């Protein structure tokens, strides 16, 4: 019927009202993900920045502790080496003590 056709046209107009709300919310939907992807890349950039920031902070100080451990070990062997030199002289000092102790006893015995 003619009225039914014009009714169908009214439906098509209603759809012209709907589909416009459709096609567009997709545009509002499509931008919503643009916002997420724009955010994601910025996070994995801060990630690579933090991980990169700490890793180098470790590498740079772990090089100072190593240069300290070497510099430490360097004198720890020098102390021992000088610990000997201290004993060598001590061996002579106390040996110089027994001589004047008994050089005495004989000029005494005299």
């Amino acid at each position: 019927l003619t009225t039914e056709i014009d009714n169908n046209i009214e439906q098509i107009s209603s759809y012209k009202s709907e589909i416009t709300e459709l096609r567009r919310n997709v545009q509002a939907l499509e931008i919503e993900l643009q916002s997420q992807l724009a955010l994601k890349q910025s996070l994995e950039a801060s990630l690579a920045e933090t991980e990169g920031r700490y890793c180098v902070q470790l590498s740079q100080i772990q090089a100072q502790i190593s240069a300290l451990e070497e510099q430490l070990q360097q004198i720890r062997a020098e102390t021992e080496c000088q610990n000997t030199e201290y004993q060598q002289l001590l061996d002579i000092k106390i040996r110089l003590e027994n001589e004047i102790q008994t050089y005495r006893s004989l000029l005494e015995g005299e």
Binding site: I5, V26, L43, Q57, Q71, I75, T79, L89, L96
Partner: protein, 104 residues
């Protein structure tokens, strides 16, 4: 014309209902991928932090163990120089005694 237009409007919803629900399945994935990433941020951020102070106190405990060992050596050298200048004085004892026996 008509039927083609009736048809022209239902292709716009049929295809759309597929695209938008595949994109809604994607909007959910992305915001899930950042949660996976935000957790990865907090992890490596928290991790490196404790791993950092672990080297801070290390270096601190160690750089203090050196300052003690540094002066401990300088101490022994003041001790070594001390009993060294006594020894020399003792080399002058046997000396003056060695001259006595020359004089008898």
């Amino acid at each position: 014309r008509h039927g083609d237009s009736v048809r022209n409007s239902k292709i716009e919803i049929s295809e759309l209902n597929r695209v938008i629900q595949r994109l809604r399945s994607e909007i959910d994935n992305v915001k899930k991928q950042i949660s996976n990433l935000q957790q990865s941020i907090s992890d490596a951020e928290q991790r490196g932090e404790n791993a950092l102070k672990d080297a801070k106190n290390k270096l601190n405990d160690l750089e203090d163990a050196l300052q003690q060992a540094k002066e401990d050596l300088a101490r022994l050298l003041r001790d070594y120089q001390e009993l060294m200048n006594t020894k020399l004085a003792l080399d002058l004892e046997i000396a003056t005694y060695r001259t006595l026996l020359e004089g008898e």
